[PDB]
């Protein structure tokens, strides 16, 4: 260590080599402009939550940290208000409800943003005359069409069911149109206050069971692995799958003749609009009590400069959080086509106690394996919801 420098500690949930390497390159560029700062960048991976929990309890936070979809709920008491920073004038308005309170606090700087729906093979849908589905009913009808017309040669909706998170993603994304987006058919208040009736969730298990029974998902869903997806998609073997984020670009590298697109998550209730799911992905929040708060803010401002924000966003394959930055990403075409579609945060992060992600994955895998029936799943979910609320409380 150089004792003529002070250390600025930054925690990140970034996972890929492109993300980590680009963040390090930008940290090095920051250091060129600030000869007295050594940036200490940490990527704790699976240990992130445990380490931040202990650091919060110790009142010993990193100077900058990633809130990764939990900005208000988990980090509200520790974050510096960023409302007086210059970059806030360009915050994507789709992020206002997620990264601000109505009373004006800006909780964190969004490096990027997540917008998840369904990924699909454009050519397959054109072969069979299928328009992008905007409702669950139209989605299922498309799956039936693909099964009928392909005579079983194309998987209509593919799951890597070996990994329970594949089913969790299904439940989590579709819980938003089911329970959140429609003012006449939502349960926001009941979810937050513990009175939610899990009988209202059964619909999603019924749909999944319909897809299984009707051979609209892959026959091998219980044993299919994430590592198989790119090759199968590039071989024109899959019509739809839940969005993973880099599928199109990865497939194009192997077979440029296959064009993968994305669409928003279909709506469920009549008259409701399709929705993008995500919002926060990676953020930089400053610890309000950091002795190096000024430097932390200088680093955020540096990251928010358009050339830097574009670079970082592109490494993550997602749009920037700022309107003055147009990251050249693979799905940019589709995000422009769907520019007026709204964004909802991930259901589990806002509406369920911590721990429910794994439970959603569990029950979906047990459904696919014919261990649990839809009615019994909702009862298990309710029990875990109650238990995990009781534990997060006490
Ligand atoms: Cl965390
Ligand atoms: Cl897997
Ligand atoms: Cl994707
Ligand atoms: Cl962008
Ligand atoms: Cl979990």
UniProtKB/Swiss-Prot annotation:
Gene3D superfamilies for this protein: Periplasmic binding protein-like II (3.40.190.10)
Keyword Transport in annotation: yes
UniProt keyword annotations, A-Z: Cell membrane, Lipoprotein, Membrane, Palmitate, Polysaccharide transport, Signal, Sugar transport, Transport
Membrane topology: Lipid-anchor
Keyword 4Fe-4S carried by entry: no
One cellular-component annotation, GO: plasma membrane
Induction comment from the UniProt entry of this chain: Repressed by the transcriptional regulator MelR. Induced by melibiose and raffinose.
Description of how the protein assembles with itself and partners: The complex is composed of two ATP-binding proteins (MsmX), two transmembrane proteins (MelC and MelD) and a solute-binding protein (MelE).
Annotated family: Belongs to the bacterial solute-binding protein 1 family.
Name listed for the protein in its UniProt record: Melibiose/raffinose/stachyose-binding protein MelE
Species: Bacillus subtilis (strain 168)
Gene: melE
């Amino acid at each position: 260590a150089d004792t003529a420098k002070k250390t600025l500690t930054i925690y990140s949930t970034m996972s890929t080599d492109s993300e980590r390497d680009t963040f390090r390159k930008l940290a090095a560029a920051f250091e060129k402009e600030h000869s007295d700062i050594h940036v200490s960048l940490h990527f704790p991976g699976n240990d992130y939550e445990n380490m931040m929990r202990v650091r919060m309890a110790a009142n010993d936070l990193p100077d900058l940290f990633d809130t990764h979809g939990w900005g208000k709920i988990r980090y509200g008491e520790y974050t510096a208000d960023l409302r007086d920073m210059k970059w806030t004038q360009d915050l994507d308005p789709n992020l206002n409800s997620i990264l601000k309170n109505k009373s004006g606090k800006v909780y964190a700087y969004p490096i990027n943003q997540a917008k998840d729906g369904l990924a699909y093979n454009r050519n397959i849908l054109d072969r069979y005359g299928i328009a992008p589905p905007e409702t669950m009913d139209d989605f299922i009808k498309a799956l039936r069409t693909i099964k009928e017309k392909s005579k079983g040669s194309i998987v209509p909706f593919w799951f890597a069911g070996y990994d329970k998170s594949s089913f969790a993603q299904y439940y989590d994304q579709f819980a938003t149109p089911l329970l959140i987006t429609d003012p006449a058919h939502n349960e926001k208040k009941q979810l937050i206050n513990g009175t939610f009736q899990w009988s209202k969730f059964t619909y999603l298990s019924e749909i999944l069971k319909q897809m299984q029974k009707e051979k609209l998902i892959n026959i091998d869903a219980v044993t299919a692995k994430k590592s198989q997806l790119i090759e199968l998609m590039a071989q024109n073997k899959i019509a739809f799958t839940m969005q993973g984020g880099t599928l199109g670009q990865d497939v194009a590298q192997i077979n440029p003749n296959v064009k993968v697109g994305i669409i928003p998550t279909p709506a469920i209730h009549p008259g409701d609009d399709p929705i993008w799911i995500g919002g926060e992905r990676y953020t930089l929040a400053a610890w309000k009590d950091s002795p190096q708060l000024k430097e932390a803010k200088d680093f955020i401002a540096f990251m928010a400069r358009p050339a830097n924000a574009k670079q970082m966003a592109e490494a993550t394959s997602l749009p920037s959080g700022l309107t003055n930055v147009k990251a050249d990403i693979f799905y940019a075409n589709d995000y422009e086509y769907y520019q007026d579609v709204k964004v909802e945060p991930y259901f589990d992060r806002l509406y369920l106690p911590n721990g429910m992600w794994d439970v959603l994955g569990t029950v979906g895998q047990e459904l696919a394996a014919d261990i649990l029936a839809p009615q019994d799943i909702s009862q298990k979910l309710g029990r875990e919801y109650k238990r995990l609320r009781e534990q997060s409380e006490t």
